[PDB]
């Protein structure tokens, strides 16, 4: 849809991968603020609002927080504390008509600037002249809508740019959109650092004989500590004390070493 009436769509209740979206050669213009490109997957958001439209090459710079312009003031206003960012790419191939007027229009006249994230459907005549226009279209009563005229021969500043703005909202509720956080391979029979569905720990993962219930995820034994996980048992690898048996420096120098409560098949060796 045109910039004067931008189409807004909601993304929620799904996992979003921004890494593929950000590492794309198609998207020429990618400036993001209030968000981290490095941690976008880590960040979670309740709602995503995507506003899509088409503008000129010069007007892309106008669409930015704290930036004012003809398009920004009367068509699309961005809040100062805006969270999210904008994506722009060239689409001169789509507007391949040699020459003529297009249905794309922008509100070049308006009584006053827009409030942030405000849409103006009405296209009534702008009474520019102080004389009462009396609802007559003509001089001093110019039509607010103005066409674009996207010609293929036009310069780089006049080429059509397909601009989509994503705004991320965290309401008074848990987020519904999170990053892929793709899982890595599973390693057992050796004590490793594990993070299963937010349950963090370190230890050996071992094949399990205990049978859980279909809805059950974690597993706790007496004293409320994790002993199994979904099914693998978590057993922390051999830790203990080490003591040094010496006959006394007065009589000798060599010593023996006892690793207490350690099956030393792992680490003149006696069990």
């Amino acid at each position, epitope marked *: 849809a045109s910039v004067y009436a931008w189409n807004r769509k909601r993304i929620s209740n799904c996992v979003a991968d921004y890494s593929v979206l950000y590492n794309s050669a198609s998207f020429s213009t990618f400036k993001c603020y209030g968000v981290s490109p490095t941690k976008l997957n880590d960040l979670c958001f309740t709602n995503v609002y995507a506003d899509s439209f088409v503008i000129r090459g010069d007007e892309v710079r106008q669409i930015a927080p704290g930036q004012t312009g003809k398009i920004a003031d009367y068509n699309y206003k961005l809040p100062d504390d805006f969270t999210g960012c904008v994506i722009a790419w060239n689409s001169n191939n789509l507007d391949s008509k040699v*020459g*003529g007027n297009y249905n794309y*229009l922008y509100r070049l006249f308006r009584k006053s600037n827009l409030k942030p994230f405000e849409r103006d459907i009405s296209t009534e005549i702008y009474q520019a002249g102080s004389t009462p226009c009396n609802g007559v279209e003509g*001089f001093n009563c110019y*039509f607010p*809508l*103005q*066409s*674009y005229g996207f*010609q293929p021969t036009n310069g780089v500043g006049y080429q059509p740019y397909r601009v989509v703005v994503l705004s991320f909202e965290l309401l008074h509720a848990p987020a519904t959109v999170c990053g892929p956080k793709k899982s890595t391979n599973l390693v057992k029979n050796k004590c490793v650092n594990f993070n299963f569905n937010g349950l963090t720990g370190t230890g050996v993962l071992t094949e399990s004989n205990k049978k859980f219930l279909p809805f059950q995820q974690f597993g706790r034994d007496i004293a409320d500590t994790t002993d199994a996980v979904r099914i693998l048992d978590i057993t922390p690898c051999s830790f203990g004390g080490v003591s040094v048996i010496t006959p006394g420096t007065n009589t000798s120098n060599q010593v023996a070493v006892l690793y207490q409560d350690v099956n030393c098949t792992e680490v003149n060796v006696f069990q």
Partner: nanobody, 129 residues
Framework: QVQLVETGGGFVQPGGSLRLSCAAS????????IGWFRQAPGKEREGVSC????????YYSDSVKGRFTISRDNAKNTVYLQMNSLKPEDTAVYYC??????????????????????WGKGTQVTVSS
């Protein structure tokens, strides 16, 4: 490379008759509204006339009095404006300017704002005692 030019500014005592020619070159638009905007020294940018190329509908100010006739020369891509009974205050340098048409709701609108795309070197008209 769409070019516009104005010619024919004339000097004479009050009440004369003059012809202004608006010649364009390399126009890439099938439909275009053409306007005349005056500017002498001390005199700002205010519209006098603007015309739609699809049919020839004409918008004009409270100072036309009928002596401003603008013909759409289709063959020579020109606006032929002729004014008789010269007005000593309408003295000014004149720019003839081209804007794209508007296709909204299946109908054509021709809007000519204070800024109208590209302008052209003006022609000064002086008429005084």
């Amino acid at each position: 490379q769409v070019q516009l030019v104005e010619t024919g500014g004339g000097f004479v005592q009050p009440g004369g008759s003059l012809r202004l020619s608006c010649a364009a070159s390399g126009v890439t638009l099938d439909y275009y509204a053409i306007g005349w905007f005056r500017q002498a020294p001390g005199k700002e940018r205010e519209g006098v006339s603007c015309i739609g190329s699809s049919d020839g509908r004409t918008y004009y100010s409270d100072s036309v009095k009928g002596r401003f006739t603008i013909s759409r020369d289709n063959a020579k891509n020109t606006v032929y404006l002729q004014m008789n009974s010269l007005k000593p205050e309408d003295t000014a340098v004149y720019y003839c300017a081209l804007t794209v048409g508007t296709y909204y709701s299946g109908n054509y609108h021709y809007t000519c704002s204070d800024d109208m795309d590209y302008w052209g070197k003006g022609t000064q008209v002086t008429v005084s005692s």
